[PDB]
Paper text:
Structures of native A2ML1 were determined by X-ray crystallography and cryo-EM at resolutions of 4.4 and 3.1 Å, respectively. An initial crystallographic map was obtained by molecular replacement with a map excised from an early stage cryo-EM map with a resolution of 3.8 Å. Density modification with 70% solvent and two-fold averaging resulted in an outstanding electron density for the X-ray structure in many regions despite the resolution. Overall, the cryo-EM and X-ray structures are very similar with an overall root mean square deviation (RMSD) of 2.0 Å for the entire molecule. Multiple regions in the α-helical TE domain appeared to have better electron density in the X-ray structure than in the EM map, and the Gln1175-Glu1188 loop could only be modeled in this map. These differences in loop flexibility are likely to be an effect of crystal packing interactions involving the TE domain. While the CTM8 body shows minor overall differences between the X-ray and the EM structures, the orientations of the MG3 and MG4 domains within the MG-ring differ significantly due to crystal packing interactions. In both the EM and the X-ray structures of native A2ML1, it is not possible to model residues His696-Asp726, suggesting substantial flexibility of the intact bait region in accordance with its accessibility toward proteases. However, in both structures, it is evident that the strictly conserved residues Arg730-Pro734 pass through the same narrow opening that houses the Nt-α′ in complement A2MF proteins.
Human alpha-2 macroglobulin-like 1 (A2ML1) is a monomeric member of the A2M superfamily (A2MF) of protease inhibitors and complement factors. The functional inhibitory unit of A2ML1 is a monomer that depends on covalent binding of the protease (mediated by A2ML1’s thioester) to achieve inhibition. A2MF protease inhibitors utilize a unique trapping mechanism that pseudo-inhibits proteases regardless of their catalytic class. Trapped proteases remain catalytically active but are prevented from cleaving protein substrates through steric hindrance imposed by the inhibitor following a proteolytically triggered conformational change.
Numbering used by the authors: 20 to 637, 669 to 696, 727 to 1454
The structure:
Amino acid sequence: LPNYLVTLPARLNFPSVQKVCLDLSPGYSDVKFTVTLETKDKTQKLLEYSGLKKRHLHCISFLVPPPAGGTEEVATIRVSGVGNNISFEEKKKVLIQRQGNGTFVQTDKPLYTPGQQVYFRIVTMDSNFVPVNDKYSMVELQDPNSNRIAQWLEVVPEQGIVDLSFQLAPEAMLGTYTVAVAEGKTFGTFSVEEYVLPKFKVEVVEPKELSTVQESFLVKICCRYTYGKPMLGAVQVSVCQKANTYWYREVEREQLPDKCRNLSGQTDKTGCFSAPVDMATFDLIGYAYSHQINIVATVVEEGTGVEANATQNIYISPQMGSMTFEDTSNFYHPNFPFSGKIRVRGHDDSFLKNHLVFLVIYGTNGTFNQTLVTDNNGLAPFTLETSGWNGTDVSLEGKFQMEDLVYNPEQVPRYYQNAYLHLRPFYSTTRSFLGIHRLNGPLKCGQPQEVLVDYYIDPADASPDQEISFSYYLIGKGSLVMEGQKHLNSKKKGLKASFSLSLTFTSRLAPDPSLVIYAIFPSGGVVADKIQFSVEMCFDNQVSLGFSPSQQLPGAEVELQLQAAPGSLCALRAVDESVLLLRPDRELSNRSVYGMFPFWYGHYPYQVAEYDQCPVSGTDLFSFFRDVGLKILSNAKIKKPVDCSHSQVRQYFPETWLWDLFPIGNSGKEAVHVTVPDAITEWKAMSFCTSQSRGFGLSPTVGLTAFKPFFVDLTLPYSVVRGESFRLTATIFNYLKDCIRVQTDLAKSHEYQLESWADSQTSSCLCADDAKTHHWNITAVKLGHINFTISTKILDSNEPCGGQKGFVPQKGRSDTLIKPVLVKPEGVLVEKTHSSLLCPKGKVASESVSLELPVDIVPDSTKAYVTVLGDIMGTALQNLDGLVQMPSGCGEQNMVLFAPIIYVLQYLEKAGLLTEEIRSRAVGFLEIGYQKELMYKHSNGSYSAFGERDGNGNTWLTAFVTKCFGQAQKFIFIDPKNIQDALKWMAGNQLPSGCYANVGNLLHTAMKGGVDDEVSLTAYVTAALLEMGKDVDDPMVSQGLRCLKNSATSTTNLYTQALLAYIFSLAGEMDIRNILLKQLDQQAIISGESIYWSQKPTPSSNASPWSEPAAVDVELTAYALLAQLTKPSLTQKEIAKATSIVAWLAKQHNAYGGFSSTQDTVVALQALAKYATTAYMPSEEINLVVKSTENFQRTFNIQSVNRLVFQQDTLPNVPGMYTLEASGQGCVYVQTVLRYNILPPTNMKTFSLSVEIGKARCEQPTSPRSLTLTIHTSYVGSRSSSNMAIVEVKMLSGFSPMEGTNQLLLQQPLVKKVEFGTDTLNIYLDELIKNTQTYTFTISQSVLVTNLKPATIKVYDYYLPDEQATIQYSDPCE
Ligand SMILES: *[C@@H]1O[C@H](CO)[C@@H](O[C@@H]2O[C@H](CO)[C@@H](O[C@@H]3O[C@H](CO)[C@@H](O)[C@H](O)[C@@H]3O)[C@H](O)[C@H]2NC(C)=O)[C@H](O)[C@H]1NC(C)=O
Ligand SMILES: *[C@@H]1O[C@H](CO)[C@@H](O[C@@H]2O[C@H](CO)[C@@H](O[C@@H]3O[C@H](CO)[C@@H](O)[C@H](O)[C@@H]3O)[C@H](O)[C@H]2NC(C)=O)[C@H](O)[C@H]1NC(C)=O
Ligand SMILES: *[C@@H]1O[C@H](CO)[C@@H](O[C@@H]2O[C@H](CO)[C@@H](O[C@@H]3O[C@H](CO)[C@@H](O)[C@H](O)[C@@H]3O)[C@H](O)[C@H]2NC(C)=O)[C@H](O)[C@H]1NC(C)=O
Ligand SMILES: *[C@@H]1O[C@H](CO)[C@@H](O[C@@H]2O[C@H](CO)[C@@H](O[C@@H]3O[C@H](CO)[C@@H](O)[C@H](O)[C@@H]3O)[C@H](O)[C@H]2NC(C)=O)[C@H](O)[C@H]1NC(C)=O
Ligand SMILES: *[C@@H]1O[C@H](CO)[C@@H](O)[C@H](O)[C@H]1NC(C)=O
Ligand SMILES: *[C@@H]1O[C@H](CO)[C@@H](O)[C@H](O)[C@H]1NC(C)=O
């Protein structure tokens, strides 16, 4: 009878196109076939084909119909063949399933410091490696507290690629961040910590995984600096084996002592110490000790005493070798030779060449032995004659050695990993053979490959005149790739010959494709073979990367050759090799891209898995197609009839070098020139590109070696004082093989004095892996930043440098390093500010400033300038990042750089002056503020002044922060979970009377501005809510307002009156606003035309022209000015009263648009924003006249175009009298700023301040000097307790706080946060009482500076700069 064979994949993908094949044996000229696909919605007639007079295999392709269930659906494949007298039908079940899309997220590094800009990319592709260009609903970024800190909505890719960036905050939240795409369904993570710290690295070079067969192993501990030069010092080693912890507990049993072997010694001139450690010390065998050796190496530097450690754990493994079966199947053909290979490896996986290995054959006819020898690739080929096997199962085992190893049973056994193979005979009803040659190695993709096919045809299955049709099949990834038929006429080649197949491996073919070849004889029998290949993981878009040249000096040019398909867009990544080495994670690799998709599935899915229905009552041709994911319908004898009776510590993470997108032109190649970085390290680079024509591509990881012959290092102090001598330490390092003559020149300048003088000139000779140190005594002369230029260069010297001539390379002859050092003047800088509001109403408006100088002025510190702007807010606009020159490290003090930006933008938007250049600058500032604040978020959602270092949230600061994040949603993104969880916690702390409890107090009495009771807070929380736009019908407002009505009846405090007047100006109860505003007028102090309020007693009448900002008065005056400006329609008499209040608040400014502290700088600029929003006028032309005594004059111009422009000019004239003269129409804000240095006055009016100095060993001149400071302070001021306190400890020149100075102070009383600065240590104290407090820490000297000038210890109330104290301290050995 004639046969048929229908095949199609068992798993059909809805985006993919699949094939269904039909293999017809001859004899169907009257029988018509129709292969239909029967689903739920339709019956799709796939293939419709009648038979021929010969054997003809006819495949078709078709589009997969949509699965009905949205995700997947089981359908029915039906094959029917209707003829004259023949009618038969057959069905199978198949699985249609939606394709998975695999999305990846690549960050430029996987570890960042805070303040670095994080760049990342997002591309979605399908299993055909085609980039998806659909829009994404939401890309958001999450911080370690899982607060949503940025989002981009409706991002459209460019050729499938999304390129995004985010600026980290310079102290941003430490930990693991999360990048979410498409509602959290696909994501990636990256880390942020502080690093780059170590000066040198202790490296354990020789430690590697050990084996119990070693008698001793050599521990090699090499110590080299971070730039690579060796370091001399003493080494101590601790090579221990700890006792294995055991779960069982028994009385009077102790853990065994750690078997150790301690070693000590010194490094050689390579920086390495080495000593063998015998394995007899450690119990290599007992369960009572752990199987790991722990090596602790601690190295103290020769001379300086700098200590560093290293820990490497070494697991011990007894395994000595492995063996695997490659190029073999799990089946065989009887009577014909079965070939294979045996791969043999040692304990380190090296290919063991010419190794005698034993192949043992287990069978029914006896145990037979063959000896094999391996080749240079570690492969041992064999061939077994299956004619003597009688068609039975044979179990194969490859052994290293024949006799079994004899070991003591208590001892840990070393074993050899044998290879095993179970062979089932292929059931054939024919006596023929079909056997396929297999190819060696992972095959190169795209190249045509010739595969040889051996065959024998027994004459009892087919006549020797009959033409023989072999049909072959090629499967990749569980789908049909290639098909064909090889016809062989048995007269031309005989009945024993071979043929070849010309195959080409593409990317759509799997990394493991399957070739199945079969032929049906007229008896219905089948003979087949199945072989799987190893292909390189390729892509249809060839992307290459290349550097030209691949080695270059730092600072020079280099050509970056980038190649892809035409029309491709490429995403470059150039990274320090240390970054790819320290986390070899899922960085983008060919294995990672294939790893996204389940390509390993090549079996029937369980929804359409074909089981053998056995009546349970209490390797053939079908098994080949199931093993490649192919369903099969056939009537030939294809199946066996069913029988039923049952990281590391290697290096730093510096700059991401290159991160750009490059489009590839029509040429297919693109070359750009990039400048090589100054750092001496090797750069690894990779590129990935997308094209709609060729799909995704990926490059090889190519390198660029930035190498310079010699490196120089500058050890310089940061800041020194005038009159001091410091030690400039310059070291010169040689990385070459040869000795070079080097001459190091210190550039002569008039800005410092050299004590070396003419002794500095020489030319010392420096050989290989060698270093020469150069020092200069430098007396500090000029004040300011002084550049120190050192030019070290290689000479063409003929003197004996090394024995032969001194080497001169042709590139890298002269290295020049320039490092500046600040020479700060003595004492403390003082600032004085006379800010003026001149509104020329057509007339000439005039004011006069007198620059009076004190007597004991530190020289050259005198500078003064004048700032002119067309806007009263404009001084704060230029210094939004620098409003207050104070530490901003608490929960509230950070908000001095968040709140004022929001009111400025609301003013500039409502006045329309908001440019995109300004909006882009400002928006980025708020993002840096938002991140710092979230470090003070608690887990419940509230905020405190120091985060979780406080026990609870603070009621007032949470209401203040919530006020700002809601109004920030109009400009930048804010997570609503932060707003809602702050409101959820504050609603819980609302008291029954509608007032708010002061959890964490109402803050300090000059911070808050007031204290009297809890009603004072009920004022602010309701005020903040209404600022946010909340309703009067809001439950937190309405119950809040109900508590504020009976307590507005008999209220006495001046602050509380001005605060309440703001609230009822927002609440709309004008009846109570006017009662409180009139109580303000009777307390108003009018000085000239200025109207302000003050809780402090009235001065005589004299207000100093220079700013003396009472933070009580400044904050208080704005809350009145705010209460005035919330009447929705303003009279010209109310505008003028607001104008009269303004003429005092604008005078108290500092040099940066700030005032004196946190809230007052916020509240007053918040008020002046509401005034400038109300009183905005585009100024026509204001012409300002500046006059001085000694022939100095200056004219500025202010129009509506430069209203916001910061215009500044310094006064060349010595301090005298100056005259403003404002003419035009508009208003011009003019500020006068004076600076000088005086000696710090020992003022002890509000705080007691003293300093004890602990005993340093002055008689030790080669010890890193330690000074132990003991500081005493107390609040002797008028009130009971102070506010939050700063202890500002300026350092001595060349000193630094020791390791653990943070952790020392935090345990000591009242300390909340310790902060080390550049040259100043700031300590936060909660408050200071009248009890003398004592705080002690130790500082050490890192750079020698002599003739030490005194540094300044300063203690001051943060929210009251007027309540301060200042002392000095000096070196006791000087
Ligand atoms: C893998 O990615 C593809 C490509 O984006 C996803 O297919 C797309 O899914 C969307 C949403 O279901 C389809 O848009 C819709 O079009 C219909 C008309 O057919 C319209 O009535 C809807 O309102 C909607 O706009 C889009 O056509 C479809 N694209 C293709 C080529 O079919 C697919 O869902 C992703 N698969 C997975 C598992 O994520
Ligand atoms: C290698 O050297 C480093 C640096 O000397 C060692 O790290 C240090 O370990 C000590 C002891 O645990 C830490 O001090 C402790 O800090 C906690 C708070 O963090 C405090 O409550 C304790 O009272 C104590 O002072 C110290 O912070 C830590 N330093 C750093 C920079 O991590 C490290 O343990 C050494 N490793 C080996 C194997 O020798
Ligand atoms: C993933 O891609 C990497 C490239 O980043 C592939 O690395 C390749 O590794 C092989 C094996 O070392 C190298 O193949 C050799 O090529 C020479 C001809 O240049 C040939 O004579 C040798 O017999 C050998 O086949 C190859 O140079 C290297 N690079 C590239 C670009 O192919 C890696 O194989 C890929 N991995 C997978 C699983 O596909
Ligand atoms: C101390 O040395 C540094 C060099 O390390 C000096 O800074 C340099 O100042 C010059 C000014 O002529 C800069 O040249 C120009 O800079 C501008 C601004 O970016 C640029 O548009 C020009 O194309 C040109 O390159 C030079 O780049 C700059 N170098 C650095 C690294 O900032 C500094 O002025 C010296 N200070 C003293 C007190 O000696
Ligand atoms: C530099 O010269 C000054 C002169 O007073 C001396 O005191 C100091 O010790 C010298 N330092 C070095 C490193 O030579
Ligand atoms: C958070 O607030 C709740 C009250 O809602 C309080 O019980 C809890 O102790 C607070 N936790 C912290 C860490 O502030």
